[PDB]
Design a protein around this ligand. Sequence first.
Ligand code: NAP
Ligand code: NAP
Ligand code: NAP
Ligand code: NAP
Lengths: 244, 244, 244, 244
Amino acid sequence: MELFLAGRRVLVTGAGKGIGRGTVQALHATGARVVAVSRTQADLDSLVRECPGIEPVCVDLGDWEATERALGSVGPVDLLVNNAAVALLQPFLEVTKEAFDRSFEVNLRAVIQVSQIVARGLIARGVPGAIVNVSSQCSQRAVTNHSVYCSTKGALDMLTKVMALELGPHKIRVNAVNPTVVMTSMGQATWSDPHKAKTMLNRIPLGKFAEVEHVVNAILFLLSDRSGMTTGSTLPVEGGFWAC
Amino acid sequence: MELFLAGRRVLVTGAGKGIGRGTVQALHATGARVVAVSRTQADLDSLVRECPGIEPVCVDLGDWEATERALGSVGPVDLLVNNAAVALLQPFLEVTKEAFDRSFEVNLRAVIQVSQIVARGLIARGVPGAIVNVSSQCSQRAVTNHSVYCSTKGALDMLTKVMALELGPHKIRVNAVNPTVVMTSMGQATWSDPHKAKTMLNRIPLGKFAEVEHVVNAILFLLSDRSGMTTGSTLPVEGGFWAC
Amino acid sequence: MELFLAGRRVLVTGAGKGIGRGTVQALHATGARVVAVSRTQADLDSLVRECPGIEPVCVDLGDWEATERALGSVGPVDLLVNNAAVALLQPFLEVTKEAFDRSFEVNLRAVIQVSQIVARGLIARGVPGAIVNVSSQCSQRAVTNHSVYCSTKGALDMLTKVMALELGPHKIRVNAVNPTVVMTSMGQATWSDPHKAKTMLNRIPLGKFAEVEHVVNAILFLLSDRSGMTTGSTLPVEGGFWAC
Amino acid sequence: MELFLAGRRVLVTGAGKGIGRGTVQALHATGARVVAVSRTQADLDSLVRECPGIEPVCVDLGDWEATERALGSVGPVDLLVNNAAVALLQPFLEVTKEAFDRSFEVNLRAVIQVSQIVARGLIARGVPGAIVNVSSQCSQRAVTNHSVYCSTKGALDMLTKVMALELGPHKIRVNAVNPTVVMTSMGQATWSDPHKAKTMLNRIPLGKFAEVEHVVNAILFLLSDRSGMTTGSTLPVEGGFWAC
Ligand SMILES: NC(=O)c1ccc[n+]([C@@H]2O[C@H](COP(=O)([O-])OP(=O)(O)OC[C@H]3O[C@@H](n4cnc5c(N)ncnc54)[C@H](OP(=O)(O)O)[C@@H]3O)[C@@H](O)[C@H]2O)c1
Ligand SMILES: NC(=O)c1ccc[n+]([C@@H]2O[C@H](COP(=O)([O-])OP(=O)(O)OC[C@H]3O[C@@H](n4cnc5c(N)ncnc54)[C@H](OP(=O)(O)O)[C@@H]3O)[C@@H](O)[C@H]2O)c1
Ligand SMILES: NC(=O)c1ccc[n+]([C@@H]2O[C@H](COP(=O)([O-])OP(=O)(O)OC[C@H]3O[C@@H](n4cnc5c(N)ncnc54)[C@H](OP(=O)(O)O)[C@@H]3O)[C@@H](O)[C@H]2O)c1
Ligand SMILES: NC(=O)c1ccc[n+]([C@@H]2O[C@H](COP(=O)([O-])OP(=O)(O)OC[C@H]3O[C@@H](n4cnc5c(N)ncnc54)[C@H](OP(=O)(O)O)[C@@H]3O)[C@@H](O)[C@H]2O)c1
């Protein structure tokens, strides 16, 4: 199934590691032009060696002012993957103002700002496009010590819906993907305990956590014209965790 | 994106018309071996002329005993699309025992029976597979005169979930697709009035009804290993109707 | 908080045992006039001794023709609790035509028929009313061996929604309550194993199953004018099971 | 139905106007002791005249530091209603950093902080309690120019779920209410146009917007032991808007 992603310009946030990195790798492989945005220079340096031709942008996306300046003259961008996020885990009764603020600045505010920059561009050019927001299984199911992170992802699901409503007339589709634990730096920080992960694994009908490739495939399908009547959705990549 | 559907054996119900017909057409074009099951012989005759080498099975899927007999020695089936359904529309206070019975027999009990036949075969062979159930935007939003139809589709969503739970350990994924109005015989029976369709259209961010191709694309993605951590889901093909 | 249920005429199905029995008991204590409908005569005999002045109607609600005949001259009914149901548990691959048919006949088609009888009466009289459908935590989460039962309850949720839509203009509200395990004959048939119940209990934030009183309280709130802008809803009585 | 709210100490945020004000009025009428928290002194002055004995606290709840200082020695609080919110409406492509920040500080961060203060108190005293979060119909359905406000409410729904999970062991229930337009200063700012409200009204089965009394009744029921197995829920007070 040809997705018709070849030659199109794609911006990926949180491109340094895990899902964002895999997404840049897949897009570069299929002949897309990629803008790779991430917080840590070393991650972008190695990525550009692996994927020659991608345009690295090193910026902290929790910084509205710095984001605007860095994504300033990004150029035409046809397709957008909002993947950058932080998981700042604290028991509810220990949540701090600082962890709340940081989480919403990165996981949600930056989704607004980057998507605005991309959408404005598409509309000015009079051309259709697509946005995928990387949410989570946790966007619709609570997990201990994830009050902030779950709230950002629940917010992100709804944000996705409003964006879909308002951008649909401009032929811009906006979807979310919702993965279970993916063993990456985030995933194997706290799910690295074989029995903390055990209780969750028992709740997953397919009996396993998600690979980066599972998430990337879902993102690519949602970016493509193959999903041309899908907008405002939350596509689960969690092995049936939501079902039971 | 290669879906790896070439050579696999696929059974599609309600193959005679609309979405099921389009699904047969797409699968045959990609090199799958198809078992086309539908109620009306003429539909199947023409489809075999269009798609030489498909195996037609003419049966009324509302008939448990006749389905068992017809789908008896169907052979190895790796993939299953449960698409046959009836939309018997009556105001709630006019709902009849007959309309209820027929609707549940075709729209749900046949999903069980045909899925058992295929699943039992997969388990005997010890091989993975996938099932797609064609649901509806109505599975989750009520529409006047659709009390029975809405209930079958709401049931079918939850059926998809239990099937996902129980078949997951056998590496069989089970997903639903949930289209808005598709202008087919069913779609353009009652949504043929330009203002009955107008109120719904105003609720769709993408400002249009779904084409058969939109639904087939989602089906083919959910059948393929590209959607390998998606099970128990309800993938909307409704232009954003659920979102707003 | 006065619910203004004194003097109103209430019909309750499955009144013989568990939740329906408790509902009759509570309503009779508050001064409602109750029509108690249930399958087994002995259950109704004892309940009328406990609750003198209730009107017993012994009928099998799975029988459309017999229900029509029994609920024929029931008289003015202002409020309706659809509680009768069967839990026929079979592994998915063991589901039978008979179990499916029985389950849908009692759990759903009877909800339609009894609701039509009451609603038609309300509309003829030109007076407002309310209907409560007793659903399940299973309406929205799959449980092994509950493919049929889960599907009836998933259907019943969506039925509640269409009924709410169509009856709203007649000032008739229609809501569902969705309890977790309630230790009654149904609840303590299969959840009687202390470790089968253990895995579910660990998923309930309140760390316990529901008492009959919990469910009756939610029913009575949804019947009263206190819930006057609530219709089409699914009120969980599951200790937080859906939330996590 | 006695709710057993008499004599218990209840804190209500956004008590100055609309739903929060009605809630203080109802609680004061039933004999509860009320802490009334709101931004504008004049609103609290008049409230205390209407409801002698309530403890006014004038504070901007978007200010973490000022909140901590003001709700410092509040005293024992048994029950909590988080109602303060701002609706800062902007088209998606016009959303500003300032409107995002303000909305999340008030609508969500303050819910965290106030609920922490109350919960810590309950736990220190070893006593059960209840929290109700005033969300919205918009928490699960997108509305034009409400991207920020819808995202706060979607976040609030999820927050409610995590809080329910973590506080359930401490016998603290946490629920949300989700009203449609209530004609208050917020409601009749933008829904004051008789045809902007017309499209929404047509989508409401009960054919009307919510009164303050509808919301207050739902809050009281969720605060009471009558809803003793309900936690992590989102109780709609939107006349069936979600159903169709
Ligand atoms: N694995 C899981 O448990 C899991 C589950 C469900 C959903 N998700 C979601 O999946 C997505 C990807 O997560 P992952 O597991 O791939 O995480 P990861 O391995 O931690 O990758 C996240 C990437 O985002 C970048 N990033 C974070 N904050 C940033 C900021 N302020 N500015 C610029 N870049 C920033 C990170 O950079 P630095 O490392 O340089 O900070 C990193 O390159 C997220 O949206 C996450 O919420 C993850
Ligand atoms: N089109 C829409 O508006 C819409 C919207 C939401 C969901 N859906 C769902 O999409 C699927 C496809 O519908 P469609 O629009 O393509 O409908 P269609 O054009 O009416 O085609 C339905 C096909 O299923 C077959 N079928 C029906 N009952 C059968 C039975 N008892 N045994 C064997 N075959 C049977 C029909 O055969 P005969 O014609 O010979 O009876 C027909 O070939 C269904 O599951 C439907 O509910 C459709
Ligand atoms: N308890 C749980 O675990 C649980 C959990 C989630 C949801 N629910 C739902 O809660 C409701 C009440 O169940 P329960 O636990 O109270 O069950 P129960 O203790 O088994 O009582 C069910 C009552 O309904 C009656 N009934 C069943 N079929 C009938 C028929 N065809 N015609 C007339 N009466 C009939 C039964 O009569 P006979 O006994 O004479 O057959 C019995 O009096 C149902 O809608 C059930 O699905 C229960
Ligand atoms: N009516 C609707 O359209 C509608 C619909 C669905 C849900 N809701 C929700 O219902 C709840 C009540 O809204 P309403 O219609 O009653 O609104 P309202 O009439 O505007 O009342 C909101 C109250 O909250 C107070 N408040 C706002 N920000 C505050 C802050 N930073 N610190 C302290 N107090 C603050 C307001 O004070 P000032 O006026 O002094 O700022 C006011 O007294 C909210 O959670 C709202 O989101 C409203």
